[PDB]
Design a protein around this ligand. Structure first.
Ligand code: KAN
Length: 297
């Protein structure tokens, strides 16, 4: 955590944008990586909470400029950029505001069936197009290879938990990693650009028309397994549940649905380990103790 006042936000912005005059500023959201501010009701400026989140913002800015007119839904559009320092790769970025509310599982399920299904269709089309974007211009650094990531998590957990876990417990952790890594189904996919945080909170909805009017938060995007972007929608109360995602899958013409379920299941078990790592790497320490406690069971 770094934290900001309105005067700091304004001065950072005035420095690089001296002719953009500012009336209203108020906090609009706050994520793991950035705080968001609404300026003149027409712009959302993200300011990083730490270096990690700044690097996330920098990556978001860059992917958006590559895909800005390639999708069938609106996406955030970058209008203002800050600067790199020794602490942040980018001090802030200002985006066009997208009107709408999050498409919560509550909101979704109270829609008439016809809108519900059109939502599934519109999401499938957004994903099918996103996953078909040609990635060849893209920086090779965006490639998230899932085998390497898992091998790397195993060593980070070992390094982190070696003094915290009893020998037999750490053996069982090594067992779970070995087991995941021997199953080829997690690691044979054709990589493509994926949103990689595709969930109900990043899907915006227009309640006058009852249709999806935007997709937001591209800070996690990578070139990786297209199946990541369904599994993040599958969790029953938290997200949409299986019946809805299966409609999305059918529109997307997915060919190996039992593969997605399998990755979903493993992902959900994998959450405890993500809570430990992601706790420390995002220095949020109640996740850490929680994951560790789940692991000791
Ligand atoms: N109790 C909260 C839930 O949290 C996880 O999922 C949630 C993600 O954590 C959120 O996002 C953050 O974590 C992501 C991992 O995907 C990263 O991409 C990103 N840096 C972060 O912004 C996402 N928007 C909503 C989603 N429901 C678990 O899977 C789930 O079991 C658990 O119930």
């Amino acid at each position: 955590m770094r934290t900001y006042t309105f005067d700091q936000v304004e001065k950072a912005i005035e420095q690089l944008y001296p002719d953009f005059t500012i009336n209203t500023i108020e906090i609009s959201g706050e994520g793991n990586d950035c705080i968001a501010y609404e300026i003149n009701r027409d712009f959302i400026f993200k300011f990083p909470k730490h270096s990690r989140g700044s690097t996330n913002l920098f990556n978001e800015v860059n992917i958006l400029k590559r895909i800005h007119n390639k999708l069938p839904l609106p996406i955030p559009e970058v209008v203002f950029t800050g600067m790199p320092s020794e602490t942040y790769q980018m001090s802030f970025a200002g985006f066009t505001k997208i009107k709408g509310v999050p498409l919560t599982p509550l909101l979704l399920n109270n829609l008439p069936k016809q809108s519900q299904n059109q939502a599934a269709k519109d999401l499938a089309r957004f994903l099918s197009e996103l996953h078909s974007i040609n990635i060849s211009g893209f920086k090779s650094n965006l490639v998230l290879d899932f085998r390497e990531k898992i091998n790397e998590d195993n060593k980070k957990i070992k390094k982190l938990l070696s003094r915290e876990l009893k020998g037999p417990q750490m053996k069982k952790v090594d067992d779970f990693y070995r087991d995941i890594l021997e199953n080829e189904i997690y690691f044979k996919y054709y990589p493509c650009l994926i949103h990689n945080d595709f969930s109900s909170d990043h899907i915006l909805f227009d309640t006058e028309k009852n249709t999806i009017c935007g997709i937001i938060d591209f800070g996690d995007a990578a070139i990786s397994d297209p199946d990541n972007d369904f599994i993040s929608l599958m969790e029953d109360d938290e997200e949409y549940g299986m019946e809805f995602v299966s409609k999305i899958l059918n529109h997307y013409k997915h060919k190996d649905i039992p593969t997605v379920l399998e990755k979903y299941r493993m992902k959900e078990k994998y959450w405890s380990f993500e809570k430990i790592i992601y706790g420390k790497e995002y220095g949020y320490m109640d996740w850490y103790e929680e994951g560790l406690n789940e692991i000791r069971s």
